[PDB]
Design a protein around this nucleic acid. Structure first.
Ligand code: ATP
Ligand code: MG
Ligand code: ZN
Lengths: 358, 649
DNA sequence: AAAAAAAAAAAAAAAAAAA
DNA sequence: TTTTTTT
């Protein structure tokens, strides 16, 4: 069937190290418990992780000869698997809320309570974790001075051009640079789809990660495991889960285009709270995951091995400059005081516009 | 079966016989190791063999390669991979990188003989045979990655599984195809998650190469063939380049032999799996004694006029034109300021004159002499089709910009004939590229700025049949002053009727028409010839074979041959970036103030932009004599040349 | 089962304009 | 009034 190979990696030790880092980290007490507490209070809606903390923690714990491997290397080599590991670790170590909650507003939790008091009262199903998470998980690339701190070449970063990306970088975490040209609108994207089968006790849930799927028609409840269905099932919009989605493409800068060449483009998919964090016509430094994209969406049956590629955003530096709408501050106030003390202004302003033209 | 093993061990013996390739392999390995973790370039796993040595070792294996590469190349690649693996010694490797298994594919060089063809000559009997074809690059497709071998993981088992995918164009040998369906279920129902970052993806690009139109039959159009190259060398060169590619010529696809045929007269596809690519360039490096000769020429007092007179010896007179061409081919430097944006750096020259005074011939000479140049005609071009085009790539179904004419000649020179005979609309585009040397395309959902820093040389006819010397210079020209002021230098040529000059030019022309190619008799016409013997090619300072350049004795002043002049230009455009000084400033400002207030008749009005022309001409002349500073002599020569070009001797 | 179409190039007839 | 050029 499928041959097997031996790899040096094993995820059990990685997961244990992840949990140990999350619980024991000292940078207020531990930082990550401080975030997770306000997450529990339904105050924080997205979690951002820094690997500089991971690197420095691993290096400083290397002073005691117990650690055997490192994490940032495997993080750089592959990313999504570590996103799943991090979400599992967070859900295992989720703190209790220290504050009151406006609990009536959570309509999804009302539906969940109804379903539980319907099924468990008669003697219950384990709901998938993704249907319950209120938080988004984001990664942040490291800083070069942190790499300079140690001998190892834990670099990443290095804002490659659009054409500097090859087919060997698929799956890694890479940083690009360029001008944003097009930004699409915001549309809802499905994550978990919930149906209802005309009072079939538990209502079936399913999840889809691909950009296309197929629906359900007959439920597996025992009364419908009977030869004929206890009421036809329909898709329920309220119970299902959605995430904000947007699509943008980036174009190479003129300076980085080799002579006698045409600039190329690269697509970017953005999800979660980071949506609407960039506008067309600006220079940015985007860090993301370089993932493949199947061509079957075109449905041409050709390109048996050819596939398209895209990037998924993780952390955006807007860069460029802020107009700020002359928003008042102490520094600009002392600047205008200096201008008032300057006395006559208009002649100096005229002299200072275009000194190149005499 | 065992024939593969015998061929592999024979190739191992051959590799062990020679020691150069092993030295190259160990150099590559040590460079790769040194680039690992020492405070961006990498070397691909490719080595070039010279099959002349292989022929001198074994004729059977050489013949097998050159007749049926399918059964011979893979064993050689396997043996090379085994040797590289044995020589490799990495006790502490990485995890994802070690599973690459790069097979170290080969490249060839040497004499082919009857297997060096042209795109017109390729036909049925040449299929399945290694070949080397020359041509010009017409168009290129888009770089797209493709999958080879995926990696899966299952949480329960902890055992990684991998599946390998290959297509007809991936490998030389036909095998049962495998679809791109991801296996996500084990044999016992375990869930398998595809592991990105551990799978294998390689680049892919398709180009099409065309035969050179100069070597074409009587009244027949140039033709083209299809080339696929991948892995390394994936985006070398560009459209509009002379290349020579060596690869396997094979047929693929059912072609309608199945039930899908709709007519009896169907055919098959033909395609080339490229192995290696070389820049033909009709070579570009400098030797030690070459630099010594360039230096000893430069330190001479009178190099500039010798170089000027060296241009196009068959054209009589027009010495100042030759000097202007020489200065234009190696113009001044670009200036960019954090606040002052950009300043134009090269020179532009326009020619207007009476008919049949050898302008097109000199333009053709400039075409042949310069490194990169493109030929355009006013009546045979369209302005929108000159800069960019919106065309849809066939494989992707997406419309992408196609490079225009003058964009291909970025940093080069573009020559235009019958300039005044061009449609006025196109002219405005020229103004744009003469304003900031940048063309912008905003159409059909594409907004992009394209760089174009080329220089323009052109010739145009007066409004009448002949130039009228008694009229307003603006009256004699059909072009608006808006773009005429852009050109730095404008020349007016007229054939004054003097019997002495008539006799001299008659003697020169009659001397020219009595020329015979060396080694050839006069009784028969010029015939076509074969290519060079080797498809790929490559004591000092004591011979001066072509260094002095004086091929024959006709005048006391020396002359230099074209290749030496091109080598001098190549050295000068890279090795020196001169800077001006205050003495040249004083001379230039004095001349500008004098010329501004001479207050007499002149061919064209002067303005502030002429000082820029003086600055750039002085910089170019400093580049000519290979000095890092501009001295007042260059200011003097620039002023004299400007006075000649605008006042008249 | 279906890629199908915006972007170019070239050939006219009508109207208006300049001599 | 006629031929030219643009739509
Ligand atoms: N000084 C000269 N030396 C050699 N040949 C000359 C010289 N002057 C004119 N000729 C000849 O005159 C002929 C004119 O050819 P060509 O069409 O290139 O000239 P031109 O001035 O560029 O004309 P046009 O404006 O019609 O293109 C050529 O055959 C060229 O050899
Ligand atoms: Mg001519
Ligand atoms: Zn039901």
């Amino acid at each position: 069937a499928l041959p097997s190979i031996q790899l040096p990696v094993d995820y059990n030790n990685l997961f244990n190290e992840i949990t140990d880092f999350l619980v024991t980290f000292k940078q207020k007490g531990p930082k990550y418990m401080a975030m997770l507490q306000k997450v529990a209070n339904r105050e924080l809606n997205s979690v951002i992780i820094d690997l500089d903390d991971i690197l420095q923690y691993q290096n400083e714990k290397f002073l005691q000869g117990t650690q055997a491997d490192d994490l940032v290397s495997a993080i750089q080599q592959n990313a999504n698997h570590f996103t799943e590991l991090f979400c599992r670790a967070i859900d295992n170590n989720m703190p209790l809320p220290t504050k009151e909650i406006d609990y009536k507003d959570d309509v999804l939790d009302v539906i969940l309570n109804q379903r539980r008091l319907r099924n468990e009262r008669m003697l219950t199903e384990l709901f998938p974790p993704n249907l319950t998470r209120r938080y988004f998980l984001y990664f942040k690339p490291l800083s070069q001075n942190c790499a300079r701190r140690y001998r190892k070449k834990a670099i990443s970063s290095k804002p490659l051009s659009v054409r500097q990306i090859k087919g060997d970088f698929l799956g890694q975490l890479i940083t690009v640079r360029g001008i944003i040209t097009r930004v699409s609108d915001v549309k809802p994207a499905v994550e978990v789809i919930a149906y209802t089968c005309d009072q079939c006790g538990y209502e079936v849930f399913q999840e889809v990660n691909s950009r296309t799927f197929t629906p359900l028609s007959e439920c597996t409840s025992e009364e419908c495991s009977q030869n004929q269905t206890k009421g036809q099932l329909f898709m329920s919009t309220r119970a299902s889960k959605f995430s904000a989605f947007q699509e943008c493409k980036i174009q190479e800068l003129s300076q980085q285009v080799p002579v006698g060449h045409i600039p190329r483009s690269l697509n970017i998919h953005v999800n979660g709270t980071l949506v609407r964090s960039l506008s067309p016509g600006d220079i940015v430094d985007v860090t993301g995951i370089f993932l493949p994209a199947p061509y079957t969406g075109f449905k041409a049956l050709k390109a048996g091995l050819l596939t398209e590629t895209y990037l998924e955003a993780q952390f955006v530096r807007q860069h460029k400059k802020k107009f700020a709408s002359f928003s008042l501050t102490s520094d600009v106030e002392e600047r205008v005081m200096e201008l008032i003390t300057s006395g006559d202004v208009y002649n100096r302003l005229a002299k200072s516009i275009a000194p190149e033209i005499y | 079966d065992a024939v593969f093993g015998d061929r592999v061990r024979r190739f191992q013996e051959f590799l062990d016989t020679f020691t150069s390739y092993r030295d190259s392999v160990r150099s590559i390995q040590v460079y790769n190791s040194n680039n690992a973790a020492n405070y961006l370039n990498i070397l691909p796993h490719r080595i070039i063999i010279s099959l002349d040595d292989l022929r001198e070792f074994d004729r059977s294996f050489w013949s097998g390669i050159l007749v049926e590469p399918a059964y011979f190349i893979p064993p050689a690649e396997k043996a090379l991979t085994d040797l590289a693996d044995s020589m490799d010694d990495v006790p502490h490797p990485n995890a994802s990188a070690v599973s690459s298994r790069h097979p170290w594919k080969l490249s060839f060089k040497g004499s082919f003989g009857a297997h060096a063809l042209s795109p017109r000559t390729l036909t049925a009997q040449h299929l399945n045979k290694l070949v080397s074809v020359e041509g010009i690059v017409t168009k290129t497709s888009l770089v797209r990655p493709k999958l080879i071998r995926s990696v899966h993981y299952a949480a329960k088992t902890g055992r990684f599984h991998y599946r390998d995918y290959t297509d007809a164009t991936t490998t030389l040998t036909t095998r049962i195809p495998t679809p791109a369906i991801y296996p996500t279920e084990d044999t016992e129902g375990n869930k398998l998650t595809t592991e990105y970052g551990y799978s294998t993806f390689i680049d892919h690009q398709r180009i099409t190469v065309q035969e050179m139109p100069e070597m074409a039959p009587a009244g027949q159009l140039p033709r083209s063939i299809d080339v696929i190259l991948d892995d390394d060398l994936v985006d070398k060169t560009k459209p509009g380049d002379r290349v020579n590619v060596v690869g396997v010529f094979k047929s693929l696809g059912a072609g309608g032999m199945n039930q899908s045929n709709s007519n009896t007269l169907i055919g098959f596809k033909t395609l080339i799996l490229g192995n290696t690519v070389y820049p033909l360039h009709a070579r570009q490096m400098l030797t030690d004694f070459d630099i010594r000769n360039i230096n000893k020429l430069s330190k001479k007092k009178d190099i500039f006029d010798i170089l000027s007179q060296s241009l196009a010896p068959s054209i009589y007179g027009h010495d100042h034109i030759k000097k202007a061409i020489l200065l234009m081919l190696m113009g001044g430097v670009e200036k960019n300021l954090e606040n002052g944006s950009h300043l134009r750096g090269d020179i532009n020259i326009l020619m207007v004159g009476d008919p049949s005074t050898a302008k097109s011939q000199l333009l053709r000479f400039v075409l042949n002499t310069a490194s990169l140049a493109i030929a355009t005609t006013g009546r045979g071009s369209s302005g929108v089709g000159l800069t960019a085009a919106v065309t849809t790539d066939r494989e992707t179904g997406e419309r992408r910009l196609e490079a225009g004419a003058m964009v291909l000649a970025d940093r080069g020179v573009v020559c235009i004939d019958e300039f005044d005979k061009m449609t006025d609309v196109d002219r405005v585009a020229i103004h744009e590229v003469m304003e900031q040397q940048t063309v912008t395309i905003a159409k059909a959902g594409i907004h992009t700025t394209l760089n174009a820093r080329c220089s323009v040389i052109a010739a145009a006819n007066p409004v009448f049949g002949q130039y009228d010397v008694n009229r307003d210079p603006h009256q004699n020209i059909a072009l608006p002053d808006s773009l005429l002021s852009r050109f730095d230098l404008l020349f007016v040529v007229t054939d004054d009727i003097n019997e002495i000059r008539d006799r001299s030019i008659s003697e020169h022309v009659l001397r020219t028409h009595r020329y015979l190619p060396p080694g050839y008799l006069e009784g028969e016409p010029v015939r076509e010839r074969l290519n060079l013997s080797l498809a790929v090619g490559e004591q000092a300072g004591a011979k001066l074979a072509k260094n002095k350049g004086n091929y024959n004795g006709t005048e006391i002043p020396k002359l230099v041959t074209i290749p030496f002049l091109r080598k001098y230009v190549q050295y000068a455009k890279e090795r020196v970036i001169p800077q001006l000084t205050q003495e040249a400033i004083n001379v230039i400002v004095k001349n500008y103030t004098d010329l501004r207030n001479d207050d007499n008749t002149k061919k064209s009005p002067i303005t502030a932009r002429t000082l820029e022309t003086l600055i750039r001409l002085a910089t170019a002349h400093a580049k000519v004599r290979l000095s890092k500073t501009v001295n007042k002599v260059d200011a003097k020569v620039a002023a004299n040349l400007l006075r000649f070009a605008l006042l008249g001797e």
